[PDB]
Amino acid sequence: ERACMLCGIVLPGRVFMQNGCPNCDSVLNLRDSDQATVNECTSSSFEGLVAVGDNEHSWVAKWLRVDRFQPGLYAVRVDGRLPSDIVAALEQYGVYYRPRDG
Amino acid sequence: LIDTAVKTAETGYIQRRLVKALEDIMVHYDGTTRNSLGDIIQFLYGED
Amino acid sequence: IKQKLETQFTCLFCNHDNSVVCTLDKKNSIGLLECKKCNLSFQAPINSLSQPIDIYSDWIDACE
């Protein structure tokens, strides 16, 4: 299992390779990446497992800034940060990265 | 055989409590019989 | 003599646990549940064998 460093979702790593990040596949394009890319945008190290069942009405989800995302498992703390080159590319897309590492 | 084996511990307990009750009782040089607190138990041992 | 007993039952309305008090009057066969919080009161008949779990059971069926 790895945690996305952009949305915090927790999925089996191969999922990040097979389908990309459900919440941020569009800007992150992990589906069409190599393993080095997936491992730079997702972390094997994370803490605080959160079942979010109702993203739009959960206060827990709002605090973790996952209220606009899909129901699923999320992490309170994701270790590592997105590589500066990917942060720069996301910013070109109007996406603002707020690190989830504390 | 059961009686001898059982009642030996009954009397063994009896002797233990008796000894602890009485162990500190001594005849002193004035003839009185006293315990370790100096309480008089008999003014003259065995009354004789 | 009346029996005033505290219980570990949850009030069916305010949901505070360990706040339901049971007063069992056997001389008149009248049992009384009381909250200590919202203080909702509920009366039900009791026999001689009843206990705080008997009237609290009758309170669950009186709601449903």
């Binding site: - | - | 570990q8 949850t10 026999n47 779990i53 059971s57």
Partner: protein, 511 residues
Amino acid sequence: WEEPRLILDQPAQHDNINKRYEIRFGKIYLSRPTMTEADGTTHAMFPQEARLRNLTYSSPVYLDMEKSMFTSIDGNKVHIGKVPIMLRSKFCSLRTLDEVDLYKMKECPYDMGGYFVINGSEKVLIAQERSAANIVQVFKKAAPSPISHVAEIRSALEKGSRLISTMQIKLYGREDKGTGRTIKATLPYVKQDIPIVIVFRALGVVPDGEILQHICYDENDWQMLEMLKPCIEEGFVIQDKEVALDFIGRRGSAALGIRREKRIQYAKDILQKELLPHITQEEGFETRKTFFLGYMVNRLLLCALERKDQDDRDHFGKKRLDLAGPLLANLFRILFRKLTREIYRYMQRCIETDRDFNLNLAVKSTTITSGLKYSLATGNWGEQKKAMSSRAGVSQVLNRYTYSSTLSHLRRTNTPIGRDGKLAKPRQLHNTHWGLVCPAETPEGQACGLVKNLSLLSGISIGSPSEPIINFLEEWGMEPLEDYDPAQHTKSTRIFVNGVWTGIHRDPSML
């Protein structure tokens, strides 16, 4: 086959596809004892080698397991461990051989077996004395108690003879003290004693006149009726089945908020199962339990009316000896559930990977093998983590000081009452021991009178199915329990088979 199938279930949404995972245990096969070296080579193990290399003389056990995969949008033999083999039994490699070969295997023809070899040490199982199951015993109670007489029975099934539950019926009220002299019972998994009349109603027989027709079979005697008088009036206000069952469901006090719509249906299980499970556990047979309950109350009052002595707890006919067979089954039962749980906990992780399990990997033979070895080596009868609240000394190192001592040691019996409490009953040589245990052979000291030894011609019953006996009784004229009325049957004899009031005959002398 006591719990023959494991079942899982999982609703998946992403097209709901119920996928029950099921595993079925089949035939058992046994192999002769085998030594497997670190090499990997195998050979038949004989006793002497095990004695010389501190091995365990044990047989590998293999169990058929069957997989099946229900799916609804709405194989190879596995090894469970090793079981120690009793020497000279049918599964020991010495049972054959004959006289010519025994000397070559360094075995002595005077050695009669009956023991196990665990880490090179010879361990013998000591027969464990216990009280019989499925029998009613009545005892009197001491003066500073509101109870004066108690009837007691320990529930036990026939299939495998394992304990289930224990039940009591207490008669309150002392001599001219206790006022209303009523009778309440004790039920498994219920808090405080419930009056008898209430449980009669709770089984489907509310009619008072019917209740007394089930207990007392002599309307003529006032005494066998005046003592049941307060029991009727203290349970009068419970006038139908539903409010009776409800009260029992409230007594348990488990999961506050069960409700009537269901608190009845929870108590109906506590009445159908657990309460007297030796009679039956299938539905729609509550007539047998109601009739049996009346018998108990009848026996209780006969002792309270001084028309029958209280039972003698030391009467040997009320006793049983657990030997190697029954003792191993109880231990094997506990360990096989432990193995079962480890399989179940392992499937919930190995199926989230959605990968076909290899089966053997999900069977850790160390659970049974270490379990049996540890208990036979130490005598601690239970799971290793629970050395407390168990029984010690069931297995002992076989005394080989002299030949006579070996014979005595293999025929020893033990009563597990305990050193504490001298007592003037157990240790004593009761009259009914005649011809069954030795009147002379008993240890000096703390065990004196509690450890006994079987007389020379004694034997122990191996066990027999009760089903052929029932067929013989009905063929000869036994009449069912639905046809029985104390007014019509004021003189016939009751018939019990393993403690069950099955049928009553009118002419017992020919039968």
